[PDB]
Design an enzyme around this catalytic site. Sequence first.
Site, PDB file in Angstrom:
ATOM      1  CB  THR A   1      -0.852   0.237   0.894  1.00 37.21           C
ATOM      2  OG1 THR A   1      -0.675  -0.069   2.601  1.00 37.21           O
ATOM      3  CG2 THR A   1      -1.868  -1.416   0.917  1.00 37.21           C
TER       4      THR A   1
ATOM      5  N   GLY B   1       1.815   2.583  -2.548  1.00 32.49           N
ATOM      6  CA  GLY B   1       2.788   1.981  -3.333  1.00 32.49           C
ATOM      7  C   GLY B   1       3.470   3.012  -4.132  1.00 32.49           C
TER       8      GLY B   1
ATOM      9  CB  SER C   1       5.139   7.953  -4.861  1.00 30.04           C
ATOM     10  OG  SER C   1       4.194   8.348  -2.998  1.00 30.04           O
ATOM     11  N   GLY C   2       7.289   7.310  -3.044  1.00 29.56           N
ATOM     12  CA  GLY C   2       8.126   7.474  -1.942  1.00 29.56           C
ATOM     13  C   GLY C   2       9.159   5.553  -1.319  1.00 29.56           C
TER      14      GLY C   2
ATOM     15  CB  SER D   1       6.973   7.388  12.411  1.00 35.29           C
ATOM     16  OG  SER D   1       7.415   8.474  11.880  1.00 35.29           O
TER      17      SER D   1
ATOM     18  CE1 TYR E   1       2.634  10.301   9.972  1.00 35.86           C
ATOM     19  CE2 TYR E   1       3.995  10.532  12.188  1.00 35.86           C
ATOM     20  CZ  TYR E   1       4.048  10.207  10.630  1.00 35.86           C
ATOM     21  OH  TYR E   1       4.546   9.449  10.010  1.00 35.86           O
TER      22      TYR E   1
END
Lengths: 233, 233, 233, 233
Positions: A12, A14, A16-17, A137, A150
């Site tokens: 997912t 998928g 970019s980045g 993160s 976040y």
Amino acid sequence: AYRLLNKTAVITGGGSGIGLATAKRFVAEGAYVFIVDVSRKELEQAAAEIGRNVTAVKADVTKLEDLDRLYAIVREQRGSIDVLFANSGAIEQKTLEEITPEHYDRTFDVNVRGLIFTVQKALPLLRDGGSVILTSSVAGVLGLQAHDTYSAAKAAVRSLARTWTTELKGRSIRVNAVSPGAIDTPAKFAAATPLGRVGRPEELAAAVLFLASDDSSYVAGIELFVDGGLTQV
Amino acid sequence: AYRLLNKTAVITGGGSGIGLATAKRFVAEGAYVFIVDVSRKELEQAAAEIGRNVTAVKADVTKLEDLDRLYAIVREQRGSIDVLFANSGAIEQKTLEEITPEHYDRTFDVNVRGLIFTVQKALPLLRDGGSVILTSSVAGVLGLQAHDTYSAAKAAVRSLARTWTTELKGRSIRVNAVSPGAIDTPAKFAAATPLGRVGRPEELAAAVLFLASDDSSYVAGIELFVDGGLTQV
Amino acid sequence: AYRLLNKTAVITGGGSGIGLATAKRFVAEGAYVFIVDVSRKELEQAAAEIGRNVTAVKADVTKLEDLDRLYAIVREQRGSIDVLFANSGAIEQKTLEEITPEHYDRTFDVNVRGLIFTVQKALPLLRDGGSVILTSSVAGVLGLQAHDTYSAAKAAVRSLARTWTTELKGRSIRVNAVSPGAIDTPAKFAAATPLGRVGRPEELAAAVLFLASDDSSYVAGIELFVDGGLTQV
Amino acid sequence: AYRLLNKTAVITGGGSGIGLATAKRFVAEGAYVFIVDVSRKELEQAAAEIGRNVTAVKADVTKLEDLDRLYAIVREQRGSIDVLFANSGAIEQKTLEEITPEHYDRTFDVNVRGLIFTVQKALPLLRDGGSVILTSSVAGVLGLQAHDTYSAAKAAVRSLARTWTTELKGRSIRVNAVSPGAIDTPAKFAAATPLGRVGRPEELAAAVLFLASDDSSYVAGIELFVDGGLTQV
């Protein structure tokens, strides 16, 4: 030479980045990859760049019906899933006093809710012995100005790795979180980072490959920081 | 295909268990390996098993002069180190009330003092961009009956990966700790482990490979748990 | 009002800084205190300061025989110990490459060896349901330049809380670690501290009081950071 | 003698359990307590039990207007808030495959959404140098079967303590998480718990008191586990 030879991966975010870089590294390791993202153009671009062993699926992972359609397509084309990289993430900066119902719903929808149903809907297709990588993160263990929702949502993501580790153990499905620091994706983090630079998406894809491949066969429920030492010193 | 092609690795505790397993995997990955241990005989057997691209060095890493002689041999035959796996471990089980000064001294000398020096003296041979892995343990975060000094000393190990991350960053040397749970070395741990089994030494070797290789290029100062989820759930 | 009324406390590093601040508070909470330290003058000053319910004992707690003498004095005067604050600690800055055997030995002796034997030899005197506080450090979870052995040794101290918690649970004795940040004892830490200032020794004493007292009766094995936010954000 | 003499405390989930235990202890310590919760009957009963220096306020903290109304009442009756204990909590056991969108929404609304707006809206009344306590859980760092969303939500709660510590440091407001283990509220957890028993609500209230009081004046951003050693060994 081909650490993922003939495995089926679903990724997912998928288009970019870090999702895109993982897709490319996965295809290089001999996997068949499904890239899933919201933007038609970006999926077309990304698939052309990957160039082989790749299906692009337009899907909003926060929408359940979009996931059912994703997994019908996966069922139809490849029949099962060896690796699921449940990669999601949207960051909007707001301090506590700035948060709206709206900011909150969108942060948790995209970062937690859609992650939870991505993995739920994938269960009937996951092979026993499979591997699930959740994107958390560095923010999920830091107190960063204006990252309230976040950081909180990504700490939720890391927890899900432990719960699922317990729940899926009967099927020998491993679940781990990767927790990227500052990644160079189309400075303060770089300043306090021992390696002295942002990481490249390539480097994050390599860390997910480990988690994806048989090399991490005894590694379960972990939070793998890929942050050049940011959180570790 | 070969993920340490022509790199030179040093492994202490190289004569058996995870040290031997790591050396075989490293040679498989095209590395040249120095295995280091106390027993000439064990080393001879170990070297025959590995079978190519290996030098066996008799060294007691708790003796400074032995490390001098180790590094002189590494320096004359290969000139620098790309990967140092500073792998030690002696466990002796005593409860707090059973601790003697001799038990204390031996536990810390092998797990901490010897490791410190092993890594200090590898400094002048280590290449910039190189990778150092230290052998910690899940005991370093658990409260296990009769493991007082071993657990304490393994936490000391994981701490050093942090301080060394900060001290060597000027040279781009990554320092990371691997924390194995139960590994099958020539059931209670297995019972509480979500994968439900002890790990194989080859599975530990694989995780050390990751740390050793360019895939972990943006990973620094971590504790990588290779324990089937024991500490994670 | 008197949180430690008629409790017998033994405090090491009792002649200055956090040890003395904890003794004073423990006395104001109605405890009878042993302050233990190496310097006669400091002890006499300290006992004078405290002003009542205190016996000062000159002991080097890294010496087994000084501990035997200490505890014979404890046993004869007050019998058994309700609260042991095994406060040790000394730091000397050296980078890895500067580390000498003498430096390592002196750091580990003061910070770990003496701490193990301090608590070992208190065992026959510890009341059931009593509380043992260890002084660790924020350093035990950071990578600070030149803190190699001090941080490694403080991580070890934190690990001893866990193991001791499992070992002395039969006797309902709680063992917990306190990890101070910057404490003011006659900027850079204060700079990265959210609270924007160094702690007063009185604030650390208050945190130790909490571990000492009934208020923490359900708290065991923990690392209580008292660092105005340093290690937490 | 009175550790919260004339302080104004706001406690959500204040009609039962640890909320009520905390309100009681806080009034013992000389505070004026607002207890906040959903059930009028329960509130009335809890207000009589406490007996003095308490206002009960009926509110669903998941509703913004109920919070505006709570803070209007606090503002009128006391003018400002010294201690906010943002205590919330609902668990429903569902495994990943059992998760419904509704199960998800309820868990996160109560444990996270409600919590965010509770503290957000307290900000104009919070005195500088005030203390905020968030209820997390041991679930926030564990993988417990069928706890997927609750554990995840509780890990989000712990994160918020970190972010708020940074956001609010300019006002010297301390923010800390308390993470209860097993609490006797109107065997499995006792089994793996070094203290060998469930915690009493009074014991959790004592720990929250510590965070609320000046004894924890140099403590910020922490997760204080009050779980008999469950997550520590």
